[PDB]
C-alpha cells in the first residue's frame, strides 16, 4: 500500500470473536467515523452533528441510518433495516444530556460473514463513533445478543447456534445501567429472561472499556455546550406514588375490561376483534400453501413503518406450529381500527385469537401486556396495563408477551438508572400475573 | 364472545341481497364508523372531520380513501382503487352545505365475495357514516349498479350476471335527485341509458330510508355550524340564458372545428392527431400478441392518476373486436400535447382514429362529447361541446361517448336538483346529434 | 386528413440522414413546440417559460425532461433517461443571458428507429424549440455524435456502426464555440480525441443554419427583457493568473498526495480505498456468473441520481476484459465515504484498483483526473487536479480518464468562447502527464 495515513486500531477479544475498532483513516471530514469489525463482518459507522442549533424548536433532531450492502455479501443484486436503525436509536437517544443541535448516525455494512450478525456490530460502532464525537453523549454503551443453549446463557451466538437457542435477546446499556432490551424467547420464565439481561449487560462492559480506552487514545475533544436555564403533569407523575391515580383510579393492578369477539369477518379464514380501553384491533389469520417466512405478520394503521410490532410477531412466534405438523403458510394482519398509537400487545392477543379461530393448532394461547414504572428516590410503582397517557412519563416502560407458562417476547426501555434487579423482577413478576389475567378472559372465547 | 359492547345493527333487504348496517362497536373515537355488509362482502367506512376550521383558506379539504385488502379475499400477497374513491367523492362532495372544516372518509374492504362488488357497498358506507356523523351533510345518498339482461334493467347484478349485461351503470343520489352517473354500455340508446339512471335512482331509496331510520336509532347530534356572511362571472353565467354567449358566440349547438390527421407517427402501429379548440391529443394504437386486459388505455399528461378517462376506455371498449376474431393485445396511449385539463372525449375520438389507422377491425367509429347545463328557475340551456371555461359553471355537466347508433359510455355530475327527466333527454338527445356531427367529420379520415 | 392546420416544415440533409423540423401544429399554447425527426426517430420537444420572474431569488430555475415512450418502439410494456436530460441541460444552460424567469424543456420520444438514437435528436429539438421560443437564448446549438471506424471520424453512426467504432463522442455547441463534450473511447490519443470534437463541431453547423433559417421563417418574437443593474473571490479568480494560488500554493501542475490501499474489506472479491485530498472512495469489485450489462457500476453517496459517473463507467469500460476470455459479470460499487461533491475520477482510480485486487484481468490500469481552465483576455492557466473550490470558477473545466497509453473517457464543459484549439491541446496534453503521474503511484499497489 501507499499509506500517507494514520488509522488508530484497537483490538479486543469479545466472547469467542475478536472485535476491532478503527478510526482516523476514513471519513475525516466527519465529526467521527469508525470501522467496527467482528470476524470480518464490518459496519462503517459515521457521526455528524450540526455545530450550533437553530431557533430552539425545543425538540432533538436525531436520526440513525442502517443500510446493508449487497457487495458486503459478495453478491450482485429500506427493509426491516429500519428496525435495526431502531436498535441503535433506542439505547443512545436517552444518553444525550437533557440537546437540540441535530445529530445524524449512519451505519453501513460494508462486509458480512453470515455467521456474525452485523446488527450488534453496528451498535458498537454507533457507540464508539459517538464517544469520539465529543458531542455531549453520556458515556459509551455496549451491545450483546444472548442465546440459551444446553440451558445456559450464551454470548453473541452464531446464526446457526441460534437454531438450538430458546432465546434471542439483545441488550444495550452503559457501564451503570441497561437501557434497552429486545427479546424473542421460547416461553422461558421471568427469571431465565432476566439472567439474560444481566448476563449480556455484564458482557458489554468489555466493549465499553475498550471504547473509553480508545476515546483516550484517539477520541476528539468533548464539546462544551451547556445549555439554557410549559404544561406537563408531574402531578400525575407526582400523585403517582401511593396516591389514587386518575382517569379510572385504576388501582395499579387494574387492567381494564376487554371485548373479545371471534369469527367477526365472513370470508376470512380466522378473525377476531379485540378492544380494550381506547385501543382496538381487527385481527385476521389467513392460511395458504425475499422469502419464506411462513409466518407473516402485517400492520395496517389508520390515517394522517412501525415494526416495534415485529414484537407482536416475536410474541406470537413462540406458539406457532412446528410446521412439519401444520405445513401451511400463515399470514396474520392486524388492522388497528382505533387508537392511541402505543400498541399491539393487543394485536398479540388479537392474533392469538384469530389464529385459534382460523383453526391453527397453536401450542397455547398468547397475550400481550404493556407495563410501566415510575421511581423517585427509592419508592417505585409498577403500573399494569399502562394506557396512552401513563407513558411518555419517564423512568421505565416495558412490554411482555407470552403464554400461560412463559415469556415469548420481552421489550424494555429503561431511561433512569437506579434500577438494578429485585426491582426488575417485582415488575417483571407483576406483569406475569397481569398477563395470566388477560389469558384468563381470552380463554373464554 | 365476551361482549362489553353495544353495536347497533340494522338489516334491510336490497334487490336479492341482504344489506346490513352496523355502528357503535368499532372505531368509537371516530366521528362515525360503519361496517356495511352485503352477502358477506364487507367494507368498513370511517368518517373523521376536524372540529373547527383554521384560517378560512376558502376551500374544502375533503379526501376519501378506498383500499381493498388481500386478506379480504382470503389471499396471501393504490391501483384504480383511487377510481372507486372517485365514485365516493363525486356524489358526496356537493351534498355539503355551501363548509371548510376538513373531513376524511376512509373505506376499507375487510371481506369480499367475488360476486358482490364492494364498490357500491363502500358508497353506502360512506353514506351511512356521514349521516351518523352529524357533520353538515345534505341528507343520505343511495347507490345502485344497473345491468341490462334479457332486455330489462337489473339491480346490482353479480360479477358474472354482468357477462350477459349490455349495461354497467352506477348511480348515486339523494331522495330528491340523482347526483352522479358512471356508465359503460353496449351502444344502447339514449332512452335505454336513461331508464337505467331512473331505475337505479328509484332503487337506492330503500338504502336512504334505512339510513335515516338508523340515524334516528343511533345517529349522532347534527352539529351546528352555520357559517359566515371576489371576481367570478355570473355574467357569463347570466347572459348565459338566451343571450349570445361569448368567446366565439358559439350559438349553442356549435361544436368547434376539428383537425383530424392519421398516420402521424413513423414507427407506431397506428396514430392520430386530434385537435379541437384548445385541446389536443396525439393518440396511438399498438398491437401485440395483474393482468389481462387485452385492451389497454393509458394517459400521458403534460407538466407541473386521472382515470376519469377509464371513461375514454369505457367509451372505446364497446367497439373493440370480439377477440376470437382479432386475437391481439391492443394498447392505446393518449398523449395530451395540449390543454385545459377537461379531457378525452377527444382521446375517445383520437383513439377511435388511431385504432382504425392501426388496422384494428373496430365495430364502428366512436366519438366523445362534453355537454353542459345551466338552469335558473325553469329556463335551462344545454351547451354542446362545452369548453374549458363553460364548466366549473354549476348545475350540470355530463359526457357521452359512442358510435353512430348508440351510447358506449355516459358520465353525469348533477349538482342542482330541479332536473328530473324530459329535461334530461332534451340534453341527452341534443348531445346525440352533436355526437353524430363529430362522427361525421372523423369519417372523412 | 382534415387540415385546419398550418405546420411549418423545414427539412435538411444531415450526414446520411434527413432531419426534419416542424412547428406550428402541435402544442400551440406552449411558448415553443417542435417535432424533430431523423429517419423516423421522432422526439417532440416543448418549451414553456414563466412570463415574469418572482422575487428574484437570484437563481435560475431551469429543468429539462427527457422521456422515452414504449409505444415509440411499437411495444407493450426515469432510468438513465435523466442522463440524456443531462446532455440537454448541460449545453443550453450557459447559453442563457446572465436570467431567472423559469424555463421548462421537455423532450418526449414519440417514435423510434433502433438505428437512429433519439438522444441527439432531442438536443436538436431543445435547440430549435428554445430558438423559436424567443426566450433570451444565446443563438442556436447543434449536436453531433462522432465515431471512429476504419480510422476516421464518422457522423452520427448507427447503433451497430458503433460496434466497429473506437469512439462514441457527443458534442454540442454554438456557431462560435463548443460547449460540452461526453466521450467514451478506446484508449485513443489526445489528438484523435480532439479531431473528434472539432469534426463534430464543424458538422453541427448545418443544424444551427437550418434552425436560424427556420426561426426566421417561423420563429416567435425575441422577448425584451433586459435585467437589473456579494462575496465571491474573483481574487482567487484574479491572483489566479501567474500568481502563487492558494490553499496549498499548489504550483499548477501539482496533483496532491494519494493514499492507495488494497484488500481493504474482508468478504469482498476486490477492494480499494482511494483517498486524495478532501475526497475519498471505498471501491469494491464483485464477480458473479433490463439487462445485461455485464459490467455494472454503482455509486453510493453520503447523507442529507448522479450519473456524471456513467463517466467513471465509461472511464473504466475501455479496459474491461474481452468477456470471451473473462466470462463473468462484474459489478463495481463506489462508496464515497467522504467529500466535496465533485467526483469519481477518483472512483475511476478506485475501481481500477478494486478490479485488479479482485483479480479481473483488465487490459491496463486506468486513472481519472479533473482539470480546470481560467482565461482573461488571452492569458490562460491550466489547473491540474482541480479541487472542490477551484471549480464553479468559470470558463472551462474538463475531465479525462484513461490508461497509460490513451484516453478512455473525456468530458468538457466550456462556458467561455475564446478557446479554440492549440489552447485545447495545451490543456488536454497537460492533463495527460498529470494522469500518467497518478497511474505512476497506483502502479505501486
The cell for A383 is: 403500573
Instruction: Decide if C374 touches B, using CB distance below 8 A.
Output: no
Q: Which residue has the cell 332534451?
A: B426
Residue B414's DSSP bridge partners are: B396
Q: Which of A60, A49, A26 is closest to A105 using CA atoms?
A: A49
Query: For residue A68, which residues of chain C lie inside 8 Å, CB to CB?
Result: none
Chain A touched by B28 (CB under 8 Å): yes
Cα(B284)–Cα(B262) distance, integer angstroms:
10
Residue C188 lies in a domain: yes
* Helix and strand counts by DSSP (H, E) for chain A: 6, 20
Separation between Cα atoms, residue B2 and residue B21, nearest integer Å: 21
CA of B88 vs chain A CAs: smallest distance (Å): 17
Q: Please report which residue ranges of A219-370 form alpha helices under DSSP H.
A: 310-317, 346-357
C51: CATH: 3.30.230.70
> Does residue B206 sit at the C interface (CB-CB below 8 Å)?
no
Is the same domain home to B204 and B273? no
Question: Cβ–Cβ of B69/A300 closer than 8 Å?
Answer: yes
- Cβ separation A266–B111 shorter than 8 A: yes
Residue A325, CA distances (Å) to A322, A353, A360 in order? 6, 20, 11
CB C418 within 8 A of CB C395: no
Please tell me which residue of chain C has the smallest CA distance to B357: C1
CA dist A40 and A125 (Å) reads: 14
Cα–Cα distance, B91 to B179 (Å, whole number):
6
CA distance A95 to A173: 9
CA pair distance C286, C359, nearest whole angstrom: 10
Judge if A237 and A310 occupy the same domain: no
Cα B61 to Cα B48: distance, rounded to the nearest angstrom: 12
Q: Cα(A248)–Cα(A263) distance, rounded to whole angstroms?
A: 31
The distance of A82 to chain C (nearest Cα, Å) reads 16
CB within 8 A of C50, min separation 6: which ones?
Answer: C101, C102, C103
Residues B237 and B186 in one domain: no
- C-alpha Rg value of chain A to the nearest Å: 23
Q: Are residues A53 and A191 in the same domain?
A: yes
Q: Show Cβ contacts of residue C405 under 8 Å, excluding neighbours closer than 6 positions.
A: C187, C364
Kindly state whether residue B43 falls inside one of the protein's structural domains: yes
Closest partner CB to A104 (pick from C267, C303, C441)? C303
**DSSP-assigned letter for residue C326:** S
Write down which chains contact chain C via at least 3 CB pairs under 8 A. Answer: A, B
Is residue B223 in a domain?
no
Range of the domain at C60: 1-218
| Residue C14 shares a structural domain with residue C123 | yes
Q: Which of B257, B264, B265 to mutate to test the interface with C (most CBs of C within 10 A)?
A: B265
A67 grid coordinates: 443500510
Same domain, A426 and A396: yes
- Phi then psi dihedrals of residue A105, to 5 deg: -95, 135
How far apart are alpha carbons C270 and B421 in whole angstroms?
78
Size of interface A-B (CB pairs under 8 A): 87
| CA–CA distances in Å: residue C430 to residues B407, C181, C385, C399 | 75, 18, 11, 12
Q: Rounded to the nearest 10 degrees, what angle do helices C423-442 and C192-218 cross at?
A: 130
Residue C223 lies in a domain: no
Q: Which residue, among A412, A380, A378, has the nearest Cα to A94 in the 3D structure? A: A412
Whose CA is closest to C207, among C110, C126, C107, C134?
C126
Cell triple for residue C439? Answer: 497511474
- Asked if A159 and A145 touch (Cβ cutoff 8 Å), the reply is no
Radius of gyration of chain C (CA): 23
C-alpha cell at A263: 369469527
- Cross-chain Cβ contact C265/A33 below 8 Å: no
Do residue B238 and residue B160 come from a single domain?
no
Name which of A145, A152, A21 is nearest A84 in CA terms: A145
Catalogue the long-range contacts made by B145-151 (C-beta closer than 8 Å, 24 or more residues apart): B145/B117, B145/B120, B145/B169, B145/B170, B145/B200, B146/B170, B146/B171, B146/B196, B146/B199, B146/B200, B148/B185, B148/B186, B148/B188, B148/B192, B148/B196
Residue C178 in contact with residue C407, Cβ under 8 Å?
no
Reduced to 3 states, what is the DSSP secondary structure of residue C311?
helix
> What does the buried/exposed string (b/e) look like for A25-43 if buried means 16 or more CB atoms within 10 Å of the residue's CB?
bbbbebbbbbbbbbbebbb
E strands in C70-220: 103-111, 142-149, 152-155, 167-173, 178-188
Same domain, C193 and C210: yes
Cell of residue B291, nine digits: 393482468
Cβ-contact C171, C403 below 8 angstroms? no
Residue keyed to cell 464508539:
A128
Who's near B163: CB < 8 A, 6+ residues apart?
none
Q: Residues A313, A347: one domain?
A: yes
Same domain, A214 and A296: no
Instruction: Flag if C282 and A26 touch (Cβ within 8 Å).
Output: yes
- 3-state percent helix, strand, coil for chain A, nearest multiple of 5: 25, 30, 45
A49 Rama class: left (phi>0) / alpha (psi -120 to 50) / beta: beta
Closest by CA to B72, choosing from A331, A313, A344, A279, is A331
Strand pairing report for B279-288 and B329-338: antiparallel
- Taking CA atoms, B434 is separated from B253, B371, B437, in Å, by 7, 9, 5
Contact at 8 Å (CB) between C316 and C351? Answer: yes
C403: helix, strand or coil? coil
Domain count, chain C: 3
Q: Compute the distance between CA of residue A195 and CA of residue C168 in angstroms, rounded to an integer.
A: 67
Which residues neighbour B402 within 8 Å (Cβ) at sequence distance 6 or greater?
A: B185, B187, B315, B318, B366, B367, B408, B409, B435
| Secondary structure letter of residue C370 according to DSSP | E
Determine whether the interchain pair B44/A333 forms a contact, defined as Cβ–Cβ distance below 8 Å. no
Nearest to C267 among A1, A25, A113 (CB): A113
Distance CA B280, CA B340 (A): 9
CATH number at residue C237: 6.10.140.1490
> Which residues partner with A412 through β-bridges?
A181, A398
Alpha helices in A93-187, H assignment, sequence order: 118-132
Please name which of C107, C38, C64, C440 lies closest in space to residue C255, comparing C-alpha atoms. Answer: C440
Residues 297-316, chain A: which have Cβ within 8 Å of B? 300, 302-304
**Residue B379: strand pairing partners:** B376
- C385 and C428 within one domain: yes
The CA distances from residue C227 to A183, B59, C93, C136, C138, in Å, are 67, 38, 17, 11, 15
> What Cα–Cα distance (Å) separates residue A195 from each residue in A128, A171, A206, A257, A395?
27, 12, 18, 33, 22
Structural domain contains residue C225: no
Q: Are C381 and C405 in the same domain?
A: yes
C-alpha closest to that of B211 among B169, B175, B178: B175
CA neighbor of C211 nearest in space, from C135, C134, C141? C141
Number of Cβ pairs < 8 A linking chain A and chain C: 87
Residue with cell 459517538: A130
CA C329 to chain centre: 27
C-alpha to C-alpha distance for B41 and B34, rounded to whole angstroms: 14
User: What pairing do the DSSP bridges indicate for beta strands A295-300 and A329-338?
Assistant: parallel
Place of cell 406457532: A320
Q: Is residue B386 part of a domain?
A: yes
How is residue A299 written as a grid cell?
400492520
Q: Does a structural domain hold residue A224?
A: no
C33 part of a folded domain: yes
- Interface membership of B212 toward A (CB under 8 Å): no
Beta pairing, strands C17-23 & C32-38 = antiparallel
Amino acid at each position: 500500500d501507499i499509506t500517507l495515513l494514520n488509522p488508530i486500531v484497537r483490538k479486543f477479544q469479545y466472547g469467542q470473536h475478536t472485535v476491532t475498532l478503527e478510526t482516523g483513516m476514513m471519513a475525516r471530514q466527519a465529526t467521527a467515523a469508525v470501522m467496527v469489525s467482528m470476524d470480518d463482518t464490518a459496519v462503517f459507522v459515521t457521526v455528524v452533528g450540526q455545530k450550533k442549533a437553530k431557533p430552539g424548536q425545543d425538540f432533538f433532531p436525531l436520526t440513525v441510518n442502517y443500510q446493508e450492502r449487497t457487495y458486503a455479501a459478495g453478491r450482485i443484486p429500506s427493509e426491516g433495516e429500519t428496525l435495526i436503525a431502531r436498535l441503535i436509536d433506542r439505547p443512545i437517544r436517552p444518553l444525550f444530556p437533557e440537546f437540540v443541535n441535530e445529530v445524524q448516525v449512519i451505519a453501513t455494512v460494508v462486509s458480512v460473514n453470515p455467521q456474525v450478525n452485523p446488527d450488534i456490530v453496528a451498535m458498537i460502532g454507533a457507540s464508539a463513533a459517538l464517544s469520539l464525537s465529543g458531542i455531549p453523549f453520556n458515556g459509551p454503551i455496549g451491545a450483546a445478543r444472548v442465546g440459551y443453549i444446553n440451558d445456559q446463557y450464551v454470548l453473541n451466538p452464531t446464526q446457526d447456534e441460534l437454531k438450538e437457542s430458546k432465546l434471542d435477546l439483545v441488550v444495550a446499556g452503559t457501564e451503570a445501567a441497561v437501557l434497552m432490551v429486545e427479546s424473542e424467547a421460547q416461553l422461558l420464565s421471568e427469571d431465565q429472561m432476566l439472567g439474560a439481561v444481566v448476563f449480556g449487560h455484564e458482557q458489554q462492559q468489555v466493549v465499553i472499556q475498550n471504547i473509553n480506552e480508545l476515546v483516550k487514545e484517539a477520541g476528539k475533544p468533548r464539546w462544551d455546550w451547556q445549555p439554557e436555564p410549559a404544561i406537563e403533569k408531574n402531578v400525575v407523575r407526582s400523585r403517582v406514588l401511593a396516591g389514587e391515580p386518575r382517569i379510572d383510579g385504576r388501582e395499579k393492578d387494574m387492567i381494564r375490561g376487554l371485548d373479545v369477539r371471534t369469527g367477526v369477518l365472513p370470508r376470512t379464514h380466522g378473525s377476531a376483534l379485540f378492544t380494550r380501553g381506547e385501543t382496538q384491533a381487527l385481527v385476521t389469520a389467513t392460511l395458504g400453501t425475499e422469502r419464506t417466512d411462513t409466518f407473516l405478520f402485517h400492520y395496517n394503521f389508520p390515517p394522517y413503518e412501525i415494526g416495534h410490532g415485529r414484537l407482536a410477531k416475536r410474541g406470537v412466534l413462540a406458539v406457532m406450529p412446528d410446521m412439519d405438523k401444520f405445513p401451511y403458510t400463515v399470514r396474520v394482519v392486524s388492522e388497528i381500527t382505533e387508537s392511541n398509537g402505543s400498541s399491539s400487545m393487543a394485536s398479540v392477543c388479537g392474533a392469538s385469537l384469530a389464529l385459534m379461530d382460523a383453526g391453527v393448532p397453536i401450542k397455547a394461547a398468547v397475550a400481550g401486556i404493556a407495563m410501566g414504572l415510575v421511581k423517585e428516590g427509592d419508592n417505585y410503582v409498577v403500573l399494569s396495563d399502562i394506557l396512552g397517557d401513563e407513558d411518555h412519563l419517564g423512568d421505565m416502560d416495558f412490554k411482555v408477551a407470552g403464554s400461560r407458562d412463559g415469556i415469548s417476547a420481552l421489550q424494555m426501555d429503561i431511561k433512569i438508572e437506579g434500577i438494578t434487579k429485585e426491582i426488575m423482577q417485582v415488575a417483571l413478576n407483576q406483569a406475569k400475573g397481569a398477563r395470566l389475567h388477560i389469558l384468563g378472559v381470552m380463554e373464554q372465547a
